[PDB]
Amino acid sequence: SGVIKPDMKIKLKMEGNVNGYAFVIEGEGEGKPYDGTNTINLEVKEGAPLPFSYDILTTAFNRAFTKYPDDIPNYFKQSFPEGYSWERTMTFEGIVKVKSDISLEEDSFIYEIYLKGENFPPNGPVMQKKTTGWDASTERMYVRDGVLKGDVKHKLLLEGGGYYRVDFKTIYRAKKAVKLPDYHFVDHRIECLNHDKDHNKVTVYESAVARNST
Prior knowledge:
Order of helices and strands: EEEHHEEEEEEEEE
Protein name: GFP-like fluorescent chromoprotein cFP484
Function: Pigment protein that is green in color.
Structural class: mainly beta
Keywords: Chromophore, Luminescence, Photoprotein
Family: Belongs to the GFP family.
Strand order of the largest sheet: 1-2-3-12-11-8-9-10-4-5-6
Organism: Clavularia sp.
């Protein structure tokens, strides 16, 4: 077998604070890198119960888990076993800044994540836990400054039936040189499952599939 097996494990830690409320979350999970699916079981270790919407954390909990056709160079799978890091800004109609380092030990991906959220309205749906997940999304992948960037015009769904616009800007940086792809798309679906009353324990499931521009 090669660096990336059809089944791979996940271990992660996130340290963060949102609107001055600090927390630590640990996760373990598994996915199918070639199918583009992954599941993570998350546990709040510090800062329970979280006084904000779990949805602003879920997209932080690895594009190694993306279905790719052979005719698009796979920025992410090429980067292993050394791996890659990413940095993301999420700008809400509130701002979240996330940094993640993705490494590989045998068949386990390891993520070290730092997240800072600020400027959320205290009685808004983010701090009042009135969001109902992310819509399906399309991330445009494009090269700038010798690394891969992703943009999403995202939509956070609000209980009652509205949405907030959230602009995602991510920089993906391989730890070694890899073949750079032409611009392309990644279609995402992310969901929360099996959450307990305070989201002390949450499962995140994501599917991600790449497709070309042509």
